[PDB]
Amino acid sequence: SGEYPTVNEIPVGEVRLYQIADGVWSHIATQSFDGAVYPSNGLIVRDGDELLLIDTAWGAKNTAALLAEIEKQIGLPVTRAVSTHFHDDRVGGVDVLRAAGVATYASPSTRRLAEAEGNEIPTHSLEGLSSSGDAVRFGPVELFYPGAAHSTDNLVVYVPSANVLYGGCAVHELSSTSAGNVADADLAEWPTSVERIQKHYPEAEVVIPGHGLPGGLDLLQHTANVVKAHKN
Ligand SMILES: C[C@@H](c1cccc2c(-c3ccc(CS(C)(=O)=O)c(F)c3)c(C(=O)O)[nH]c12)N1C(=O)CN(CCCN)C1=O
Ligand SMILES: [Zn+2]
Ligand SMILES: [Zn+2]
């Protein structure tokens, strides 16, 4: 009924949308992994009379549900999708998208890592993102590669019309107590990568983590803080 929806409020398989700003929504879904249930976020950005999708809903059935929810709540076609790193909460559902007419994109790094992991693989490569600090435009967003953090390939997304920073899994929510799933992380580089985000997007008004509640710019410093203590 208006609050950001939380892990225990979303059955696995259902998707909710949350209006962030004019023409910007997050999508929230839940999934099981190793016997525990987790929420995860993605983004939807209006692109004229079409939509740009950032990240899948963590699985094929969740991603089908996402498309249905978009049709119900927004009613514009999803034409392109970007996955912000190679893990299943970002690419699981790409095959659903591709069969629903969506053109799927990721960096070449993400595509290689996805392929090697046995995850679904976006069709199109995003060049121009291979060095930290790189940025490219993609419809109504800027894509930015901050350096290695939660993964070596993680991208962040900025919506300049709304000053919305989608951090993906490089950014954690304020309630977080550790750095989440660090299996593929670079804990030592992560603070430097977060500092690059802070320097590049100082006017961000909303910051959306890969998992959990949006907030403001404090999510960046909080992330640095939890990562440094996890490394230690
Ligand atoms: C799909 C993804 C994954 C699986 C399960 C959980 C997560 C998490 C995760 C965990 C805890 C918290 C709470 S907290 C910040 O307070 O700790 C959180 F907010 C996110 C995050 C996240 O942190 O992004 N991701 C998760 N995932 C990986 O990330 C690595 N991996 C193994 C495969 C190796 N290639 C895998 O399955
Ligand atoms: Zn991940
Ligand atoms: Zn994640």
PDB file of C-alpha atoms and ligand atoms in Angstrom:
ATOM      1  CA  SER A   1       0.000   0.000   0.000  1.00  0.00           C
ATOM      2  CA  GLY A   2       2.785   2.452  -0.836  1.00  0.00           C
ATOM      3  CA  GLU A   3       5.767   1.397   1.330  1.00  0.00           C
ATOM      4  CA  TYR A   4       8.832  -0.161  -0.372  1.00  0.00           C
ATOM      5  CA  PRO A   5       8.077  -3.807  -0.483  1.00  0.00           C
ATOM      6  CA  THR A   6      10.270  -6.117   1.702  1.00  0.00           C
ATOM      7  CA  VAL A   7      11.500  -9.767   1.430  1.00  0.00           C
ATOM      8  CA  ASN A   8       8.740 -11.229   3.615  1.00  0.00           C
ATOM      9  CA  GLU A   9       6.014  -9.310   1.744  1.00  0.00           C
ATOM     10  CA  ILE A  10       6.740 -10.795  -1.715  1.00  0.00           C
ATOM     11  CA  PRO A  11       6.119 -14.507  -2.403  1.00  0.00           C
ATOM     12  CA  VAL A  12       8.688 -16.079  -4.660  1.00  0.00           C
ATOM     13  CA  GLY A  13       7.267 -15.823  -8.185  1.00  0.00           C
ATOM     14  CA  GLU A  14       5.442 -12.472  -7.776  1.00  0.00           C
ATOM     15  CA  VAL A  15       6.820  -9.078  -8.795  1.00  0.00           C
ATOM     16  CA  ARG A  16       6.026  -5.628  -7.487  1.00  0.00           C
ATOM     17  CA  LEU A  17       6.845  -2.257  -8.979  1.00  0.00           C
ATOM     18  CA  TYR A  18       7.624   0.909  -7.012  1.00  0.00           C
ATOM     19  CA  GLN A  19       7.514   4.376  -8.474  1.00  0.00           C
ATOM     20  CA  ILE A  20      10.830   6.140  -7.806  1.00  0.00           C
ATOM     21  CA  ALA A  21      10.378   9.322  -9.857  1.00  0.00           C
ATOM     22  CA  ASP A  22       8.635  10.443 -13.003  1.00  0.00           C
ATOM     23  CA  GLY A  23       9.324   7.725 -15.557  1.00  0.00           C
ATOM     24  CA  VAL A  24      11.439   5.661 -13.152  1.00  0.00           C
ATOM     25  CA  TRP A  25      10.349   2.516 -11.284  1.00  0.00           C
ATOM     26  CA  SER A  26      12.128  -0.199  -9.408  1.00  0.00           C
ATOM     27  CA  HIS A  27      11.085  -3.791  -9.678  1.00  0.00           C
ATOM     28  CA  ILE A  28      11.239  -6.131  -6.692  1.00  0.00           C
ATOM     29  CA  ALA A  29      11.102  -9.908  -6.667  1.00  0.00           C
ATOM     30  CA  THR A  30      12.171 -12.719  -4.353  1.00  0.00           C
ATOM     31  CA  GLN A  31      14.100 -15.902  -4.944  1.00  0.00           C
ATOM     32  CA  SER A  32      15.495 -18.872  -3.043  1.00  0.00           C
ATOM     33  CA  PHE A  33      19.210 -19.608  -3.076  1.00  0.00           C
ATOM     34  CA  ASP A  34      20.963 -22.241  -0.928  1.00  0.00           C
ATOM     35  CA  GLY A  35      17.825 -22.615   1.181  1.00  0.00           C
ATOM     36  CA  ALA A  36      17.228 -18.965   2.068  1.00  0.00           C
ATOM     37  CA  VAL A  37      14.975 -16.371   0.465  1.00  0.00           C
ATOM     38  CA  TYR A  38      16.190 -12.991  -0.689  1.00  0.00           C
ATOM     39  CA  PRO A  39      14.691  -9.902  -2.315  1.00  0.00           C
ATOM     40  CA  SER A  40      16.297  -8.225  -5.273  1.00  0.00           C
ATOM     41  CA  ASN A  41      15.787  -4.989  -7.193  1.00  0.00           C
ATOM     42  CA  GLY A  42      15.969  -3.855 -10.767  1.00  0.00           C
ATOM     43  CA  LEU A  43      15.032  -0.669 -12.622  1.00  0.00           C
ATOM     44  CA  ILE A  44      12.571   0.412 -15.340  1.00  0.00           C
ATOM     45  CA  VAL A  45      13.108   3.735 -17.141  1.00  0.00           C
ATOM     46  CA  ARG A  46      10.670   5.296 -19.599  1.00  0.00           C
ATOM     47  CA  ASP A  47      12.339   5.806 -23.028  1.00  0.00           C
ATOM     48  CA  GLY A  48       9.685   7.860 -24.939  1.00  0.00           C
ATOM     49  CA  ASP A  49       6.891   5.377 -25.699  1.00  0.00           C
ATOM     50  CA  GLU A  50       9.107   2.365 -24.831  1.00  0.00           C
ATOM     51  CA  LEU A  51      10.798   1.112 -21.668  1.00  0.00           C
ATOM     52  CA  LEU A  52      14.416   0.313 -20.798  1.00  0.00           C
ATOM     53  CA  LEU A  53      14.784  -2.515 -18.266  1.00  0.00           C
ATOM     54  CA  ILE A  54      17.804  -2.779 -15.931  1.00  0.00           C
ATOM     55  CA  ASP A  55      18.338  -6.341 -14.648  1.00  0.00           C
ATOM     56  CA  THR A  56      16.096  -9.368 -14.631  1.00  0.00           C
ATOM     57  CA  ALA A  57      13.855 -10.380 -11.726  1.00  0.00           C
ATOM     58  CA  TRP A  58      16.138 -13.293 -10.696  1.00  0.00           C
ATOM     59  CA  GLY A  59      14.841 -16.261 -12.703  1.00  0.00           C
ATOM     60  CA  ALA A  60      12.781 -17.172 -15.696  1.00  0.00           C
ATOM     61  CA  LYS A  61       9.402 -17.364 -13.951  1.00  0.00           C
ATOM     62  CA  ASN A  62      10.021 -14.180 -11.978  1.00  0.00           C
ATOM     63  CA  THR A  63      11.031 -12.385 -15.185  1.00  0.00           C
ATOM     64  CA  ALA A  64       7.870 -13.535 -16.983  1.00  0.00           C
ATOM     65  CA  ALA A  65       5.906 -12.175 -14.022  1.00  0.00           C
ATOM     66  CA  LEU A  66       7.852  -8.908 -14.281  1.00  0.00           C
ATOM     67  CA  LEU A  67       6.817  -8.462 -17.906  1.00  0.00           C
ATOM     68  CA  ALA A  68       3.175  -9.119 -16.969  1.00  0.00           C
ATOM     69  CA  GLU A  69       3.367  -6.620 -14.114  1.00  0.00           C
ATOM     70  CA  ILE A  70       4.855  -3.991 -16.401  1.00  0.00           C
ATOM     71  CA  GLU A  71       2.033  -4.506 -18.873  1.00  0.00           C
ATOM     72  CA  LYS A  72      -0.547  -4.146 -16.121  1.00  0.00           C
ATOM     73  CA  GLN A  73       0.917  -1.125 -14.373  1.00  0.00           C
ATOM     74  CA  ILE A  74       2.679   0.824 -17.152  1.00  0.00           C
ATOM     75  CA  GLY A  75       1.472  -0.576 -20.484  1.00  0.00           C
ATOM     76  CA  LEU A  76       4.497   0.388 -22.599  1.00  0.00           C
ATOM     77  CA  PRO A  77       6.681  -2.197 -24.316  1.00  0.00           C
ATOM     78  CA  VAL A  78      10.059  -3.212 -22.906  1.00  0.00           C
ATOM     79  CA  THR A  79      12.385  -2.967 -25.876  1.00  0.00           C
ATOM     80  CA  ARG A  80      15.887  -3.219 -24.382  1.00  0.00           C
ATOM     81  CA  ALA A  81      17.437  -4.596 -21.210  1.00  0.00           C
ATOM     82  CA  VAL A  82      20.842  -4.132 -19.602  1.00  0.00           C
ATOM     83  CA  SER A  83      22.243  -6.561 -17.046  1.00  0.00           C
ATOM     84  CA  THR A  84      24.613  -4.903 -14.581  1.00  0.00           C
ATOM     85  CA  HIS A  85      26.724  -8.014 -13.742  1.00  0.00           C
ATOM     86  CA  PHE A  86      26.819 -11.727 -14.488  1.00  0.00           C
ATOM     87  CA  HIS A  87      25.002 -13.256 -11.476  1.00  0.00           C
ATOM     88  CA  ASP A  88      21.594 -14.931 -11.697  1.00  0.00           C
ATOM     89  CA  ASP A  89      19.800 -12.032  -9.983  1.00  0.00           C
ATOM     90  CA  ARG A  90      20.881  -9.897 -13.006  1.00  0.00           C
ATOM     91  CA  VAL A  91      20.825 -12.277 -16.008  1.00  0.00           C
ATOM     92  CA  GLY A  92      18.507 -15.107 -14.920  1.00  0.00           C
ATOM     93  CA  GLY A  93      15.507 -14.393 -17.127  1.00  0.00           C
ATOM     94  CA  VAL A  94      17.445 -13.093 -20.139  1.00  0.00           C
ATOM     95  CA  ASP A  95      16.175 -16.013 -22.218  1.00  0.00           C
ATOM     96  CA  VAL A  96      12.564 -15.039 -21.283  1.00  0.00           C
ATOM     97  CA  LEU A  97      13.302 -11.463 -22.294  1.00  0.00           C
ATOM     98  CA  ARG A  98      14.842 -12.483 -25.572  1.00  0.00           C
ATOM     99  CA  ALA A  99      11.734 -14.560 -26.421  1.00  0.00           C
ATOM    100  CA  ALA A 100       9.472 -11.615 -25.564  1.00  0.00           C
ATOM    101  CA  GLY A 101      11.195  -9.320 -28.160  1.00  0.00           C
ATOM    102  CA  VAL A 102      13.549  -7.592 -25.762  1.00  0.00           C
ATOM    103  CA  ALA A 103      17.060  -6.841 -26.972  1.00  0.00           C
ATOM    104  CA  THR A 104      19.463  -7.835 -24.127  1.00  0.00           C
ATOM    105  CA  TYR A 105      22.759  -6.129 -23.460  1.00  0.00           C
ATOM    106  CA  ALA A 106      25.734  -6.391 -21.049  1.00  0.00           C
ATOM    107  CA  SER A 107      29.411  -5.536 -21.058  1.00  0.00           C
ATOM    108  CA  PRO A 108      31.754  -8.064 -22.724  1.00  0.00           C
ATOM    109  CA  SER A 109      33.124  -8.848 -19.252  1.00  0.00           C
ATOM    110  CA  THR A 110      29.649  -9.707 -17.957  1.00  0.00           C
ATOM    111  CA  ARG A 111      28.933 -11.830 -21.027  1.00  0.00           C
ATOM    112  CA  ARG A 112      32.144 -13.841 -20.619  1.00  0.00           C
ATOM    113  CA  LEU A 113      31.568 -14.371 -16.879  1.00  0.00           C
ATOM    114  CA  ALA A 114      27.952 -15.354 -17.443  1.00  0.00           C
ATOM    115  CA  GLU A 115      28.982 -17.878 -20.093  1.00  0.00           C
ATOM    116  CA  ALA A 116      31.662 -19.379 -17.882  1.00  0.00           C
ATOM    117  CA  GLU A 117      29.270 -19.612 -14.891  1.00  0.00           C
ATOM    118  CA  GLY A 118      26.538 -21.362 -16.859  1.00  0.00           C
ATOM    119  CA  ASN A 119      24.209 -18.363 -16.498  1.00  0.00           C
ATOM    120  CA  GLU A 120      22.009 -16.894 -19.249  1.00  0.00           C
ATOM    121  CA  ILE A 121      23.913 -14.653 -21.610  1.00  0.00           C
ATOM    122  CA  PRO A 122      22.744 -11.237 -22.914  1.00  0.00           C
ATOM    123  CA  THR A 123      22.926 -10.975 -26.702  1.00  0.00           C
ATOM    124  CA  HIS A 124      24.697  -7.659 -27.265  1.00  0.00           C
ATOM    125  CA  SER A 125      28.013  -6.360 -25.946  1.00  0.00           C
ATOM    126  CA  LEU A 126      28.346  -2.871 -24.443  1.00  0.00           C
ATOM    127  CA  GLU A 127      31.723  -1.466 -25.471  1.00  0.00           C
ATOM    128  CA  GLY A 128      33.231   1.628 -23.941  1.00  0.00           C
ATOM    129  CA  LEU A 129      32.993   0.400 -20.310  1.00  0.00           C
ATOM    130  CA  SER A 130      36.214  -1.559 -19.837  1.00  0.00           C
ATOM    131  CA  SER A 131      38.186   0.920 -17.708  1.00  0.00           C
ATOM    132  CA  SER A 132      37.102   2.237 -14.333  1.00  0.00           C
ATOM    133  CA  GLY A 133      35.516   5.684 -14.642  1.00  0.00           C
ATOM    134  CA  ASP A 134      34.140   4.907 -18.136  1.00  0.00           C
ATOM    135  CA  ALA A 135      30.645   6.035 -18.955  1.00  0.00           C
ATOM    136  CA  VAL A 136      28.375   5.602 -21.960  1.00  0.00           C
ATOM    137  CA  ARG A 137      24.853   6.722 -22.758  1.00  0.00           C
ATOM    138  CA  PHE A 138      22.095   4.160 -23.315  1.00  0.00           C
ATOM    139  CA  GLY A 139      18.656   5.606 -23.977  1.00  0.00           C
ATOM    140  CA  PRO A 140      17.541   7.621 -20.963  1.00  0.00           C
ATOM    141  CA  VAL A 141      20.408   6.449 -18.725  1.00  0.00           C
ATOM    142  CA  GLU A 142      24.152   6.690 -18.309  1.00  0.00           C
ATOM    143  CA  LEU A 143      26.015   3.449 -17.665  1.00  0.00           C
ATOM    144  CA  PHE A 144      29.141   3.770 -15.516  1.00  0.00           C
ATOM    145  CA  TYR A 145      31.846   1.241 -14.670  1.00  0.00           C
ATOM    146  CA  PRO A 146      33.212   2.157 -11.201  1.00  0.00           C
ATOM    147  CA  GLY A 147      35.799  -0.599 -10.948  1.00  0.00           C
ATOM    148  CA  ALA A 148      35.664  -3.923  -9.195  1.00  0.00           C
ATOM    149  CA  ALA A 149      33.393  -4.100  -6.168  1.00  0.00           C
ATOM    150  CA  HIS A 150      30.708  -6.734  -5.608  1.00  0.00           C
ATOM    151  CA  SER A 151      32.029  -8.259  -8.845  1.00  0.00           C
ATOM    152  CA  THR A 152      34.744  -7.271 -11.324  1.00  0.00           C
ATOM    153  CA  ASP A 153      32.142  -6.462 -13.961  1.00  0.00           C
ATOM    154  CA  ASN A 154      29.530  -4.516 -11.969  1.00  0.00           C
ATOM    155  CA  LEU A 155      27.993  -1.494 -13.650  1.00  0.00           C
ATOM    156  CA  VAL A 156      26.036   1.332 -12.117  1.00  0.00           C
ATOM    157  CA  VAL A 157      23.208   3.249 -13.855  1.00  0.00           C
ATOM    158  CA  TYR A 158      22.281   6.930 -13.530  1.00  0.00           C
ATOM    159  CA  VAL A 159      18.992   8.470 -14.663  1.00  0.00           C
ATOM    160  CA  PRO A 160      19.923  12.124 -15.272  1.00  0.00           C
ATOM    161  CA  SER A 161      16.324  13.397 -15.659  1.00  0.00           C
ATOM    162  CA  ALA A 162      15.591  12.335 -12.086  1.00  0.00           C
ATOM    163  CA  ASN A 163      19.000  12.201 -10.399  1.00  0.00           C
ATOM    164  CA  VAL A 164      18.409   8.515  -9.642  1.00  0.00           C
ATOM    165  CA  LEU A 165      21.500   6.400  -8.998  1.00  0.00           C
ATOM    166  CA  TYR A 166      20.940   2.659  -9.369  1.00  0.00           C
ATOM    167  CA  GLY A 167      23.957   1.130  -7.705  1.00  0.00           C
ATOM    168  CA  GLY A 168      23.133  -2.479  -8.310  1.00  0.00           C
ATOM    169  CA  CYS A 169      24.936  -4.956  -6.126  1.00  0.00           C
ATOM    170  CA  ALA A 170      27.949  -2.624  -5.649  1.00  0.00           C
ATOM    171  CA  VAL A 171      25.681  -0.690  -3.231  1.00  0.00           C
ATOM    172  CA  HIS A 172      23.990  -2.038  -0.133  1.00  0.00           C
ATOM    173  CA  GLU A 173      20.992  -0.830   1.793  1.00  0.00           C
ATOM    174  CA  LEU A 174      21.384   1.087   5.060  1.00  0.00           C
ATOM    175  CA  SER A 175      20.246  -1.860   7.225  1.00  0.00           C
ATOM    176  CA  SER A 176      22.935  -4.185   5.852  1.00  0.00           C
ATOM    177  CA  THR A 177      25.352  -5.821   8.336  1.00  0.00           C
ATOM    178  CA  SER A 178      27.869  -7.337   5.976  1.00  0.00           C
ATOM    179  CA  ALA A 179      28.678  -7.031   2.371  1.00  0.00           C
ATOM    180  CA  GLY A 180      26.122  -9.649   1.152  1.00  0.00           C
ATOM    181  CA  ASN A 181      27.350 -12.368  -1.193  1.00  0.00           C
ATOM    182  CA  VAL A 182      31.047 -11.661  -1.638  1.00  0.00           C
ATOM    183  CA  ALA A 183      31.951 -14.830  -3.530  1.00  0.00           C
ATOM    184  CA  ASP A 184      33.083 -12.863  -6.580  1.00  0.00           C
ATOM    185  CA  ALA A 185      33.911  -9.568  -4.861  1.00  0.00           C
ATOM    186  CA  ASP A 186      37.119  -7.487  -4.587  1.00  0.00           C
ATOM    187  CA  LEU A 187      36.798  -6.260  -0.958  1.00  0.00           C
ATOM    188  CA  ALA A 188      40.062  -4.302  -1.145  1.00  0.00           C
ATOM    189  CA  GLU A 189      39.075  -2.398  -4.337  1.00  0.00           C
ATOM    190  CA  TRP A 190      35.413  -1.925  -3.458  1.00  0.00           C
ATOM    191  CA  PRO A 191      35.840   1.253  -1.342  1.00  0.00           C
ATOM    192  CA  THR A 192      37.852   2.867  -4.167  1.00  0.00           C
ATOM    193  CA  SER A 193      35.103   1.953  -6.598  1.00  0.00           C
ATOM    194  CA  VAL A 194      32.460   3.422  -4.308  1.00  0.00           C
ATOM    195  CA  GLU A 195      34.526   6.594  -3.990  1.00  0.00           C
ATOM    196  CA  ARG A 196      34.510   6.844  -7.793  1.00  0.00           C
ATOM    197  CA  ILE A 197      30.714   6.584  -7.768  1.00  0.00           C
ATOM    198  CA  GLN A 198      30.459   9.307  -5.113  1.00  0.00           C
ATOM    199  CA  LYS A 199      32.715  11.598  -7.110  1.00  0.00           C
ATOM    200  CA  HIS A 200      30.937  10.997 -10.408  1.00  0.00           C
ATOM    201  CA  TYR A 201      27.336  11.361  -9.144  1.00  0.00           C
ATOM    202  CA  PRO A 202      27.378  13.949  -6.341  1.00  0.00           C
ATOM    203  CA  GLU A 203      23.871  15.210  -7.167  1.00  0.00           C
ATOM    204  CA  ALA A 204      22.159  11.864  -6.839  1.00  0.00           C
ATOM    205  CA  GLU A 205      18.876  12.226  -4.934  1.00  0.00           C
ATOM    206  CA  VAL A 206      17.823   8.586  -4.706  1.00  0.00           C
ATOM    207  CA  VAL A 207      20.214   5.671  -4.443  1.00  0.00           C
ATOM    208  CA  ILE A 208      18.882   2.171  -5.149  1.00  0.00           C
ATOM    209  CA  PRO A 209      20.840  -0.895  -3.944  1.00  0.00           C
ATOM    210  CA  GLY A 210      20.836  -4.266  -5.709  1.00  0.00           C
ATOM    211  CA  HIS A 211      18.924  -5.727  -2.767  1.00  0.00           C
ATOM    212  CA  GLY A 212      16.804  -3.876  -0.194  1.00  0.00           C
ATOM    213  CA  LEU A 213      15.495  -0.392   0.400  1.00  0.00           C
ATOM    214  CA  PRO A 214      16.387   2.748  -1.564  1.00  0.00           C
ATOM    215  CA  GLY A 215      17.645   5.819   0.250  1.00  0.00           C
ATOM    216  CA  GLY A 216      19.899   8.741  -0.375  1.00  0.00           C
ATOM    217  CA  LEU A 217      23.611   9.232  -0.877  1.00  0.00           C
ATOM    218  CA  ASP A 218      24.384   7.748   2.567  1.00  0.00           C
ATOM    219  CA  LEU A 219      23.991   4.271   1.069  1.00  0.00           C
ATOM    220  CA  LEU A 220      27.365   4.804  -0.612  1.00  0.00           C
ATOM    221  CA  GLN A 221      29.317   5.577   2.546  1.00  0.00           C
ATOM    222  CA  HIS A 222      27.439   2.877   4.442  1.00  0.00           C
ATOM    223  CA  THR A 223      28.456   0.397   1.758  1.00  0.00           C
ATOM    224  CA  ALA A 224      32.118   1.394   2.070  1.00  0.00           C
ATOM    225  CA  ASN A 225      31.812   0.999   5.854  1.00  0.00           C
ATOM    226  CA  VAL A 226      30.333  -2.497   5.777  1.00  0.00           C
ATOM    227  CA  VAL A 227      32.752  -3.714   3.149  1.00  0.00           C
ATOM    228  CA  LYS A 228      35.824  -2.443   5.044  1.00  0.00           C
ATOM    229  CA  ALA A 229      34.643  -4.222   8.156  1.00  0.00           C
ATOM    230  CA  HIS A 230      33.918  -7.425   6.222  1.00  0.00           C
ATOM    231  CA  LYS A 231      37.433  -7.408   4.697  1.00  0.00           C
ATOM    232  CA  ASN A 232      38.786  -6.921   8.235  1.00  0.00           C
TER     233      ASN A 232
HETATM  234  C1  LIG B   1      22.759 -14.535  -6.939  1.00  0.00           C
HETATM  235  C2  LIG B   1      23.873 -14.048  -6.090  1.00  0.00           C
HETATM  236  C3  LIG B   1      23.330 -14.112  -4.667  1.00  0.00           C
HETATM  237  C4  LIG B   1      22.830 -15.278  -4.024  1.00  0.00           C
HETATM  238  C5  LIG B   1      22.382 -15.203  -2.704  1.00  0.00           C
HETATM  239  C6  LIG B   1      22.409 -14.010  -1.956  1.00  0.00           C
HETATM  240  C7  LIG B   1      22.912 -12.864  -2.571  1.00  0.00           C
HETATM  241  C8  LIG B   1      23.151 -11.550  -2.126  1.00  0.00           C
HETATM  242  C9  LIG B   1      22.839 -10.978  -0.784  1.00  0.00           C
HETATM  243  C10 LIG B   1      23.067 -11.648   0.417  1.00  0.00           C
HETATM  244  C11 LIG B   1      22.834 -11.004   1.623  1.00  0.00           C
HETATM  245  C12 LIG B   1      22.340  -9.705   1.659  1.00  0.00           C
HETATM  246  C13 LIG B   1      22.074  -9.042   2.999  1.00  0.00           C
HETATM  247  S1  LIG B   1      23.574  -8.233   3.679  1.00  0.00           S
HETATM  248  C14 LIG B   1      23.842  -6.968   2.500  1.00  0.00           C
HETATM  249  O1  LIG B   1      23.285  -7.557   4.921  1.00  0.00           O
HETATM  250  O2  LIG B   1      24.645  -9.251   3.744  1.00  0.00           O
HETATM  251  C15 LIG B   1      22.102  -9.067   0.454  1.00  0.00           C
HETATM  252  F1  LIG B   1      21.616  -7.798   0.398  1.00  0.00           F
HETATM  253  C16 LIG B   1      22.352  -9.668  -0.748  1.00  0.00           C
HETATM  254  C17 LIG B   1      23.711 -10.866  -3.205  1.00  0.00           C
HETATM  255  C18 LIG B   1      24.320  -9.543  -3.317  1.00  0.00           C
HETATM  256  O3  LIG B   1      25.073  -9.222  -2.343  1.00  0.00           O
HETATM  257  O4  LIG B   1      24.361  -8.948  -4.441  1.00  0.00           O
HETATM  258  N1  LIG B   1      23.828 -11.686  -4.258  1.00  0.00           N
HETATM  259  C19 LIG B   1      23.366 -12.923  -3.898  1.00  0.00           C
HETATM  260  N2  LIG B   1      25.134 -14.741  -6.098  1.00  0.00           N
HETATM  261  C20 LIG B   1      26.324 -14.034  -5.786  1.00  0.00           C
HETATM  262  O5  LIG B   1      26.373 -12.809  -5.555  1.00  0.00           O
HETATM  263  C21 LIG B   1      27.466 -14.984  -5.846  1.00  0.00           C
HETATM  264  N3  LIG B   1      26.851 -16.271  -6.159  1.00  0.00           N
HETATM  265  C22 LIG B   1      27.553 -17.553  -6.248  1.00  0.00           C
HETATM  266  C23 LIG B   1      27.798 -17.912  -7.720  1.00  0.00           C
HETATM  267  C24 LIG B   1      29.269 -17.721  -8.114  1.00  0.00           C
HETATM  268  N4  LIG B   1      29.460 -17.183  -9.445  1.00  0.00           N
HETATM  269  C25 LIG B   1      25.439 -16.119  -6.261  1.00  0.00           C
HETATM  270  O6  LIG B   1      24.639 -16.971  -6.433  1.00  0.00           O
HETATM  271 ZN    ZN B   2      25.959 -10.447  -7.688  1.00  0.00          ZN
HETATM  272 ZN    ZN B   3      23.175  -9.128  -5.988  1.00  0.00          ZN
END
